[PDB]
Amino acid sequence: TNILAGAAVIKVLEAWGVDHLYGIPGGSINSIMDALSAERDRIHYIQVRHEEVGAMAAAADAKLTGKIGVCFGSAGPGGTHLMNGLYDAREDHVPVLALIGQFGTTGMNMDTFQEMNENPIYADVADYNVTAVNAATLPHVIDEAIRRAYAHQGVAVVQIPVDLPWQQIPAEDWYASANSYQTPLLPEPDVQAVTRLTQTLLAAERPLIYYGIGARKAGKELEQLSKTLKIPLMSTYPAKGIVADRYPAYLGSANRVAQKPANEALAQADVVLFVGNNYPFAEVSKAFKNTRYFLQIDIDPAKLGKRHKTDIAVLADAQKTLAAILAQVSERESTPWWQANLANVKNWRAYLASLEDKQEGPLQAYQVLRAVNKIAEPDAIYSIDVGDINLNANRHLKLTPSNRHITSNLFATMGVGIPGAIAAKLNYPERQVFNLAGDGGASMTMQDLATQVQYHLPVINVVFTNCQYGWIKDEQEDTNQNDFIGVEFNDIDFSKIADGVHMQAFRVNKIEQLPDVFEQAKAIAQHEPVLIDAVITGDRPLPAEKLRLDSAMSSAADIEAFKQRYEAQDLQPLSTYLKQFGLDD
Amino acid sequence: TNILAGAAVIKVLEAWGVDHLYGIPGGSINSIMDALSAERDRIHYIQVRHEEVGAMAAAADAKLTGKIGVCFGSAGPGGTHLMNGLYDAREDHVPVLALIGQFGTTGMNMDTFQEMNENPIYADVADYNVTAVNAATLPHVIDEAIRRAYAHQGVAVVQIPVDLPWQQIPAEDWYASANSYQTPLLPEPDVQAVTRLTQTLLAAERPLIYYGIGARKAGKELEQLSKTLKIPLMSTYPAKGIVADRYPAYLGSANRVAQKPANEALAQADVVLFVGNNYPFAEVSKAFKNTRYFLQIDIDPAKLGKRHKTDIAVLADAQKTLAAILAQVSERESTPWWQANLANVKNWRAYLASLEDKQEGPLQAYQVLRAVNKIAEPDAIYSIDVGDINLNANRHLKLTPSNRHITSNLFATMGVGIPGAIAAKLNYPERQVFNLAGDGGASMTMQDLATQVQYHLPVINVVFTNCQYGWIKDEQEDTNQNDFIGVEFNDIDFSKIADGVHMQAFRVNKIEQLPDVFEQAKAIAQHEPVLIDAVITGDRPLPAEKLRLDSAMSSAADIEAFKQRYEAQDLQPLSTYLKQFGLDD
Amino acid sequence: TNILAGAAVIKVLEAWGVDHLYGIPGGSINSIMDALSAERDRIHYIQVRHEEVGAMAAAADAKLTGKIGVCFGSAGPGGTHLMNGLYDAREDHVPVLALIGQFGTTGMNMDTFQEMNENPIYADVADYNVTAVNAATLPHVIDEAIRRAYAHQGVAVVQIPVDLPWQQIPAEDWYASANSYQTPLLPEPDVQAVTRLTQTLLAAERPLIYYGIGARKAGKELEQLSKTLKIPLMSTYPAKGIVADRYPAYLGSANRVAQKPANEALAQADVVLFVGNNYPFAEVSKAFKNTRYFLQIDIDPAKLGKRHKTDIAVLADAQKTLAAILAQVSERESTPWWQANLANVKNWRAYLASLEDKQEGPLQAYQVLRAVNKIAEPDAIYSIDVGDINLNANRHLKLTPSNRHITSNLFATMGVGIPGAIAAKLNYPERQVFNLAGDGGASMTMQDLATQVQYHLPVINVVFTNCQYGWIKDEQEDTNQNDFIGVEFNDIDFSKIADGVHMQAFRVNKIEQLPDVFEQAKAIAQHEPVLIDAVITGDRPLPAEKLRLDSAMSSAADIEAFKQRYEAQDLQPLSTYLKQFGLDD
Ligand SMILES: Cc1cc2nc3c(=O)[nH]c(=O)nc-3n(C[C@H](O)[C@H](O)[C@H](O)COP(=O)(O)OP(=O)(O)OC[C@H]3O[C@@H](n4cnc5c(N)ncnc54)[C@H](O)[C@@H]3O)c2cc1C
Ligand SMILES: Cc1cc2nc3c(=O)[nH]c(=O)nc-3n(C[C@H](O)[C@H](O)[C@H](O)COP(=O)(O)OP(=O)(O)OC[C@H]3O[C@@H](n4cnc5c(N)ncnc54)[C@H](O)[C@@H]3O)c2cc1C
Ligand SMILES: Cc1cc2nc3c(=O)[nH]c(=O)nc-3n(C[C@H](O)[C@H](O)[C@H](O)COP(=O)(O)OP(=O)(O)OC[C@H]3O[C@@H](n4cnc5c(N)ncnc54)[C@H](O)[C@@H]3O)c2cc1C
Ligand SMILES: Cc1ncc(C[n+]2csc(CCOP(=O)(O)OP(=O)(O)O)c2C)c(N)n1
Ligand SMILES: Cc1ncc(C[n+]2csc(CCOP(=O)(O)OP(=O)(O)O)c2C)c(N)n1
Ligand SMILES: Cc1ncc(C[n+]2csc(CCOP(=O)(O)OP(=O)(O)O)c2C)c(N)n1
Ligand SMILES: [Mg+2]
Ligand SMILES: [Mg+2]
Ligand SMILES: [Mg+2]
Ligand code: NA
């Protein structure tokens, strides 16, 4: 006849298929806790050591599986600790439900302990942001929050006065709308528009296809289009892996978390097919300043003509549209543009291999990543933190459609490595999971190494210890007039941190130490988490956006300082290859 | 080589096809004013007398045409005046761009005259809410605002420091993305879900199709499904007119702005097909408490199973889906449920006609609306304010697919009658336009009667003068223990108000005065606006949500009282017709 | 034993001595209405025709009396209409309580009719902003709101779900804290800082005392310091009247709502004593660029050295401090700087008088204000709207300590004339009350002329009809490259508007009509409101901030042009008087 409103709320989460959720209890959320406790056989609470890790893990859950992530924080500081993960979810447009503790309705607005108007706190981050005020409508409010978070691909926040979940409500009235759930309709490509797009692309002298994660389901079409038409591919950083990295006409990504051949080719291209792509650097970096024709495919009307004026714009699903192009074209002969890019890619990859293939001496990030490649399973999942590691992982990870990689793409919050790996292992216990993080980012969420131990999540944590915020040091080098500040700091030994949370760990500082340590780590992570603290040099990785290689554009002195610093003696500018095949720069 | 950023902004508006925009100038927006001044041939600025009328008319533009409405307000009080129209646009989910004046960047944050942080003012109402800080990117921010307003069907707000629009920017850099705008090509409704939905609808003993404005393209299919299957039709109030009111099995709308047959039939129905409908009274009124199967068609995933637990929810276009149902069904013979509803509708319409057809005596709202009907062109547009007029217009207006009617559907702001009619006439100069407003609502925006005169917009204004907030008085009668308060007030003579703004006007107070006054008004409104001030009684209109007609549900005393007050002696309850054709309750 | 929570709320208002409050009822606020209905003897509800007039009148209540103003609005559009008055209260830092209707707790967050999260709506405007969620604590939340509004001199907003005020709560639990309210006993101004400030003031060759409304208790000390020390006085515009306008060394105000002698003398001054003053044009106009020493007296630490680098800033009460200065100084003989300023003032006043004293011909604002002066009682209160009238009233009104004048000082919302006068008459039934408004501002709130009639408030409304937003037209003349836009519009006959609301009225357009019309108005306003619609020319009033009179600073051509346009042939620049008495620039 009756049910506790808190029990009904948990039943709503179960109906929506929520397997696990994260947070830290408090008096102000103890009635939700009480309901979770009764339901521990059907829904799985993950106690984190800091609420931001719970929010970040919830966001990563949604990034990985498409299923709404769920986190909670107690009133006041519990909830405000969620912010970095909630902004990550908003900016990476993934569905997250956040429940926030609040004092009972009898105490609200009395200015009692830890009691405040919590609604304005979440107004900016949240697509849906409500304080619940009734027990009987509470399941509906949660159901509504979940449905909107999914539909609008963002954060829903519900502040819950702690009395409400302990109130009895009629057992027969509440329901979940999970049974009615559907994902948004996929628009179809106009046949004439697609034909026009195809003809412009085929007429191009220097075409590129430039895709983002919007083309996630279209890797086959992308690679076959590239092979068939002899058109090089490039991607946003997060879109790495949609087409295998080994594909010889994959240029990489542009800007800074970037590869040399993509930056060079983009500057030369006459026509860009921009697909499922919201590259945030487009305007600020003048990426398309010399592009003659700009062709766009995107499912979101708010994106069409966003990053550049379009010549042809198609409001349709990337894969349906790319298949439609492929179906109306046939094999094209090689072109000078195609060969020039192929040779530039070979040259670039030989550079990266030369860094990876060092066998002894001071450890650099490059060999560490080679060591990851060597122990990586074909379907490994990578949770990557924020900093030099994005750049290094982007260049050195050998990914295929079978892999997943996540980071905080747009909000770019440091600390995401650890929670993303926690979320990865919960959702994919049979898959190998890496947390790749710099020392700065790993420091911010280090306490939740204990969470991997507690729940026996066999993550391979790899910390890149340069005793710097290297990403920022390099920016200060580029822009600041005065000395470096705040970018070089004291050592943390993460093997000792790991020991402290009762996780097996190693610390290495020489290239020659890698094969054996990484083999041990691989074996350990069959059953338990492991940490490798890699003490690396302060070498700056090659800035793809600040190339000094082309004698027509840089002084001989800058060229040689560049080659020496970046061990890039064998790199050729794209212009070398353009000239070989009879094209001018 | 160079162009003023302000001039570029106006070119962005023109590229998106903005015909007219509303506001009041101020020093903080005089640079936008300056650009508008040079572009009078291609964009038409409408100076309103209160900025709320500008915001409300911009919302109405979007309601009528589907094209973005555009308004502006000077810094501080100019912008804050917009609020009621901007919330109207948010709640009625139509695209509106609001430009807000701001002091120049050299004086911002100086606590100077009328200078404040304006961004937090618009955070809640707006889908997109930004302060421009650069002239060169200003055209792009305006373009982004428009593109987001359309994509998210809501309000975009841009605060513009007044220095920026007078700064020169490169002539060749800015662009509009209007050229990329398109509507999606949707797939066909899934065959198997539609088939399943159809079987359940057809298996019902007491089916209803209950549509909202999501089915605005489906009038033809709705009426044919109804006729073919013998299923009565009911709608949300705003969906009145999608199927002609004369259709014998149109029941009307439910709740309070409602018609008796819809409320009665809905209580009896075993299956409801809920199509393109977001009826906000569903849960609070327990509308579907007796429904066995609830079937849904909606284009928005956020709506799926929102209003009631749903047996089958089809994510699809309403018209495509209704056409798909119609293609798989054929004639069913008349049923008792069909005949009972037809007889119930006949009885209700005779009641309404008895009120309209009074020829002499104290004027009531009923005869006023009959007089509107008599002078109405088949494609007239009606701007309806908020109060008893929603209920009366819903019952009395004889609408067809050729009509439009708009009001403030969900935010329900009083005062929308005047601005809605201004916008209707600006968009449709050759169509007859009515403003039907209560005295309370008309007085809120009365100054903008002068805008109709200034711009020669031949609106027919009909003000219903009861010297009451009638809608609220009746509520107070129902709920309040103590005397009426704030709901009976002093007369305003709107014929004299109209005379004050130099608009021709009449004041009437007897039924027999209607024919000639309305004939004169019809004629005047061939060239100039006109106002009829109708002094009506304070009779409470029959409450469709508080029927006292059925012997089984009400005492004889209560029924005789209800029949007396509401001149309802010849009204029969639905149960009478159910019994007549052999059904129980 | 029990009391309705709503009844308790009204008792809280009564305990704090709230005499009258404003709003428009709605279903979402009908339970507060119900409590008000039972308490008509002790609290006076004023039903306005637009909720903005309620908010603005509540702000005016606080401006006039120092006691909290109280208004309300129904859920959604009722509350949002309050905004312009609530921002006025925030910016003019006066206590206002705004009650907002909300749907009952059982329907909140259900997306029902006119139901939204209202809390974020009021976050920016409000010092205190809460949604009540419990009936038993509701009286306390109202008490907290009032107490905070007073303490923080701003707006408190409470959203009240309509069910709560009809719930019974224990009769003995609730209380008001009005009994605890007091004003602080301040220490005396520190002796040594005041002595130091005095020496610097007295050492100056060209001193000015520049006061704002923080010195409203110090009129006597200000005038005596001026007379004794031979130091001219200037004020902020709102501080007009603290020292009688007839005082021969009152220079007026600076900037645009300004008088020539104040602008001229300020440019010349070597020491300024800035007292109880937060002049917002200080920095943007570079008002003190030539000042050698800047001395400050203010009660608010947040103001200390805010507007200019300050040599000595005394944190103290203005009156106590000015009395302390006066106690340590004695007579100084007339100085050249004193005589030059006196002569400059005489010359300016003769100019203003030449405009006022025209006896026949086309009516200008100048003669209208002379006609107001002639019928004004010595303790008249003036509600002034926003536009040219601020400038004209500032120059022409002959005010003394016995007068009050209010406007929207800083938010400067048009429309405040009507509500300010309603509030003035409600607080001071035995004092003569004027509303001086431009046609633009009067038309924004014109419907509430009916409120003056309904409540028998004998306001003298004077509408200045130029068929322009004159203030803005003159700005466009100064800044805009293209034609005037949005600043010249169609006539509204306000005598006919007034007739429409059943208020006696006159329309005048010639100077010779003034005496008899104003005599009739004075008489009518012994018992009933009256309106005079003054059709004035579109002559630009002399710009005190753009003087062209001094041969050393302007060309002969520019001076002759300025003298012609502004009828300023007999005006002399300050430099003439400086030279006359032996000073340079
Ligand atoms: C430290 C750091 C530095 C970074 N710097 C770089 C950098 O230098 N270079 C770089 O490339 N990235 C960089 N980023 C990542 C970057 O900020 C952006 O997140 C990324 O470039 C955007 O990638 P995207 O367009 O693939 O993803 P999103 O921004 O998520 O956009 C996806 C797009 O696809 C559309 N879409 C979705 N589904 C479909 C469909 N079915 N069909 C068609 N369209 C669809 C969406 O509407 C959207 O427009 C960096 C990240 C970090 C952490
Ligand atoms: C004073 C006043 C009183 C009122 N009281 C009543 C009342 O008593 N009774 C009443 O009926 N109304 C009343 N309303 C109006 C009411 O508040 C709601 O706005 C109305 O009932 C909702 O109508 P809707 O569902 O048609 O519109 P919306 O709420 O706009 O819903 C449209 C729905 O259609 C969907 N949709 C849009 N396009 C498509 C498509 N192509 N295919 C499929 N689905 C689509 C949307 O996703 C959405 O779910 C009143 C209004 C006022 C001013
Ligand atoms: C259309 C329009 C144009 C305007 N333009 C002008 C103009 O050109 N010229 C002009 O002068 N005004 C103008 N204003 C008014 C202007 O915006 C400012 O509001 C005004 O100049 C500020 O006056 P104030 O410093 O007296 O008041 P406030 O800003 O209220 O400042 C009061 C100050 O006194 C202090 N204070 C309060 N009590 C005490 C005390 N007991 N002892 C000591 N200090 C105390 C406070 O801390 C504060 O610093 C205009 C207004 C309008 C409507
Ligand atoms: C929470 C947070 N603080 C600051 C930043 C800015 N930021 C980006 S990268 C970076 C440095 C990362 O340092 P580290 O993790 O040690 O990586 P490294 O570049 O040294 O490999 C900083 C401080 C950020 N993105 N997130
Ligand atoms: C701005 C605003 N204030 C209050 C309300 C609440 N409200 C709804 S209807 C209504 C009465 C309208 O009175 P009137 O226009 O005279 O219509 P009537 O019912 O008398 O015909 C009110 C006050 C509202 N919707 N909008
Ligand atoms: C609500 C609002 N809108 C716009 C402004 C900007 N503004 C200041 S004065 C003014 C003109 C006022 O015109 P009017 O009332 O006719 O006075 P006039 O100068 O003609 O005498 C305007 C539009 C404002 N302060 N408030
Ligand atoms: Mg580091
Ligand atoms: Mg009325
Ligand atoms: Mg004017
Ligand atoms: Na108004």
mmCIF file with all atom_site columns, N, CA and C in Angstrom, chain B residues 444-465:
data_model
loop_
_atom_site.group_PDB
_atom_site.id
_atom_site.type_symbol
_atom_site.label_atom_id
_atom_site.label_alt_id
_atom_site.label_comp_id
_atom_site.label_asym_id
_atom_site.label_entity_id
_atom_site.label_seq_id
_atom_site.pdbx_PDB_ins_code
_atom_site.Cartn_x
_atom_site.Cartn_y
_atom_site.Cartn_z
_atom_site.occupancy
_atom_site.B_iso_or_equiv
_atom_site.pdbx_formal_charge
_atom_site.auth_seq_id
_atom_site.auth_comp_id
_atom_site.auth_asym_id
_atom_site.auth_atom_id
_atom_site.pdbx_PDB_model_num
ATOM 1  N N  . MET B 1 444 ? -2.767  46.624 -19.091 1.00 0.00 ? 444 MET B N  1
ATOM 2  C CA . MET B 1 444 ? -1.329  46.447 -18.907 1.00 0.00 ? 444 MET B CA 1
ATOM 3  C C  . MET B 1 444 ? -0.473  46.919 -20.079 1.00 0.00 ? 444 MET B C  1
ATOM 4  N N  . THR B 1 445 ? -0.986  46.763 -21.299 1.00 0.00 ? 445 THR B N  1
ATOM 5  C CA . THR B 1 445 ? -0.235  47.151 -22.490 1.00 0.00 ? 445 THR B CA 1
ATOM 6  C C  . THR B 1 445 ? -0.962  48.231 -23.327 1.00 0.00 ? 445 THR B C  1
ATOM 7  N N  . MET B 1 446 ? -1.931  48.926 -22.719 1.00 0.00 ? 446 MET B N  1
ATOM 8  C CA . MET B 1 446 ? -2.790  49.892 -23.437 1.00 0.00 ? 446 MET B CA 1
ATOM 9  C C  . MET B 1 446 ? -2.035  50.984 -24.202 1.00 0.00 ? 446 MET B C  1
ATOM 10 N N  . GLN B 1 447 ? -0.904  51.428 -23.665 1.00 0.00 ? 447 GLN B N  1
ATOM 11 C CA . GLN B 1 447 ? -0.123  52.468 -24.337 1.00 0.00 ? 447 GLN B CA 1
ATOM 12 C C  . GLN B 1 447 ? 0.272   52.068 -25.758 1.00 0.00 ? 447 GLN B C  1
ATOM 13 N N  . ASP B 1 448 ? 0.392   50.769 -26.021 1.00 0.00 ? 448 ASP B N  1
ATOM 14 C CA . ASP B 1 448 ? 0.842   50.352 -27.350 1.00 0.00 ? 448 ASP B CA 1
ATOM 15 C C  . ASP B 1 448 ? -0.262  50.237 -28.387 1.00 0.00 ? 448 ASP B C  1
ATOM 16 N N  . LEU B 1 449 ? -1.469  50.604 -27.993 1.00 0.00 ? 449 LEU B N  1
ATOM 17 C CA . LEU B 1 449 ? -2.481  50.951 -28.978 1.00 0.00 ? 449 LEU B CA 1
ATOM 18 C C  . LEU B 1 449 ? -1.942  52.072 -29.880 1.00 0.00 ? 449 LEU B C  1
ATOM 19 N N  . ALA B 1 450 ? -1.120  52.958 -29.322 1.00 0.00 ? 450 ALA B N  1
ATOM 20 C CA . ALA B 1 450 ? -0.528  54.034 -30.110 1.00 0.00 ? 450 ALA B CA 1
ATOM 21 C C  . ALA B 1 450 ? 0.415   53.520 -31.208 1.00 0.00 ? 450 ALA B C  1
ATOM 22 N N  . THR B 1 451 ? 1.027   52.354 -30.976 1.00 0.00 ? 451 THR B N  1
ATOM 23 C CA . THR B 1 451 ? 1.908   51.707 -31.945 1.00 0.00 ? 451 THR B CA 1
ATOM 24 C C  . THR B 1 451 ? 1.129   51.227 -33.175 1.00 0.00 ? 451 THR B C  1
ATOM 25 N N  . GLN B 1 452 ? -0.072  50.699 -32.943 1.00 0.00 ? 452 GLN B N  1
ATOM 26 C CA . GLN B 1 452 ? -0.972  50.326 -34.030 1.00 0.00 ? 452 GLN B CA 1
ATOM 27 C C  . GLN B 1 452 ? -1.337  51.546 -34.868 1.00 0.00 ? 452 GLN B C  1
ATOM 28 N N  . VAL B 1 453 ? -1.600  52.680 -34.207 1.00 0.00 ? 453 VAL B N  1
ATOM 29 C CA . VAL B 1 453 ? -1.908  53.930 -34.934 1.00 0.00 ? 453 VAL B CA 1
ATOM 30 C C  . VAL B 1 453 ? -0.671  54.426 -35.700 1.00 0.00 ? 453 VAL B C  1
ATOM 31 N N  . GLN B 1 454 ? 0.470   54.489 -35.015 1.00 0.00 ? 454 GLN B N  1
ATOM 32 C CA . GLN B 1 454 ? 1.705   55.003 -35.599 1.00 0.00 ? 454 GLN B CA 1
ATOM 33 C C  . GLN B 1 454 ? 2.126   54.238 -36.852 1.00 0.00 ? 454 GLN B C  1
ATOM 34 N N  . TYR B 1 455 ? 1.915   52.930 -36.852 1.00 0.00 ? 455 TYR B N  1
ATOM 35 C CA . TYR B 1 455 ? 2.366   52.106 -37.957 1.00 0.00 ? 455 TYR B CA 1
ATOM 36 C C  . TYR B 1 455 ? 1.210   51.651 -38.825 1.00 0.00 ? 455 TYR B C  1
ATOM 37 N N  . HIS B 1 456 ? 0.040   52.250 -38.613 1.00 0.00 ? 456 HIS B N  1
ATOM 38 C CA . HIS B 1 456 ? -1.128  52.035 -39.459 1.00 0.00 ? 456 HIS B CA 1
ATOM 39 C C  . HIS B 1 456 ? -1.490  50.546 -39.590 1.00 0.00 ? 456 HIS B C  1
ATOM 40 N N  . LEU B 1 457 ? -1.517  49.855 -38.457 1.00 0.00 ? 457 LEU B N  1
ATOM 41 C CA . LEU B 1 457 ? -1.835  48.437 -38.408 1.00 0.00 ? 457 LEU B CA 1
ATOM 42 C C  . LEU B 1 457 ? -3.314  48.281 -38.032 1.00 0.00 ? 457 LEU B C  1
ATOM 43 N N  . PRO B 1 458 ? -4.170  47.951 -39.017 1.00 0.00 ? 458 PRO B N  1
ATOM 44 C CA . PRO B 1 458 ? -5.637  47.905 -38.811 1.00 0.00 ? 458 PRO B CA 1
ATOM 45 C C  . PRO B 1 458 ? -6.133  46.705 -38.016 1.00 0.00 ? 458 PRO B C  1
ATOM 46 N N  . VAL B 1 459 ? -5.702  46.644 -36.767 1.00 0.00 ? 459 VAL B N  1
ATOM 47 C CA . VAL B 1 459 ? -6.158  45.637 -35.835 1.00 0.00 ? 459 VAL B CA 1
ATOM 48 C C  . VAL B 1 459 ? -7.567  46.001 -35.366 1.00 0.00 ? 459 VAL B C  1
ATOM 49 N N  . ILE B 1 460 ? -8.402  44.974 -35.214 1.00 0.00 ? 460 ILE B N  1
ATOM 50 C CA . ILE B 1 460 ? -9.667  45.090 -34.520 1.00 0.00 ? 460 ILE B CA 1
ATOM 51 C C  . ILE B 1 460 ? -9.469  44.667 -33.059 1.00 0.00 ? 460 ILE B C  1
ATOM 52 N N  . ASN B 1 461 ? -9.393  45.667 -32.176 1.00 0.00 ? 461 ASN B N  1
ATOM 53 C CA . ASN B 1 461 ? -9.276  45.453 -30.740 1.00 0.00 ? 461 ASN B CA 1
ATOM 54 C C  . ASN B 1 461 ? -10.647 45.330 -30.134 1.00 0.00 ? 461 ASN B C  1
ATOM 55 N N  . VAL B 1 462 ? -10.878 44.243 -29.399 1.00 0.00 ? 462 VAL B N  1
ATOM 56 C CA . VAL B 1 462 ? -12.117 44.075 -28.654 1.00 0.00 ? 462 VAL B CA 1
ATOM 57 C C  . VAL B 1 462 ? -11.770 43.897 -27.189 1.00 0.00 ? 462 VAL B C  1
ATOM 58 N N  . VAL B 1 463 ? -12.166 44.866 -26.371 1.00 0.00 ? 463 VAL B N  1
ATOM 59 C CA . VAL B 1 463 ? -11.844 44.825 -24.954 1.00 0.00 ? 463 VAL B CA 1
ATOM 60 C C  . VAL B 1 463 ? -13.098 44.420 -24.221 1.00 0.00 ? 463 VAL B C  1
ATOM 61 N N  . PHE B 1 464 ? -12.968 43.417 -23.356 1.00 0.00 ? 464 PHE B N  1
ATOM 62 C CA . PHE B 1 464 ? -14.084 42.897 -22.584 1.00 0.00 ? 464 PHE B CA 1
ATOM 63 C C  . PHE B 1 464 ? -14.054 43.525 -21.192 1.00 0.00 ? 464 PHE B C  1
ATOM 64 N N  . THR B 1 465 ? -14.891 44.537 -20.986 1.00 0.00 ? 465 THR B N  1
ATOM 65 C CA . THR B 1 465 ? -14.864 45.329 -19.770 1.00 0.00 ? 465 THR B CA 1
ATOM 66 C C  . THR B 1 465 ? -15.888 44.825 -18.769 1.00 0.00 ? 465 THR B C  1
#
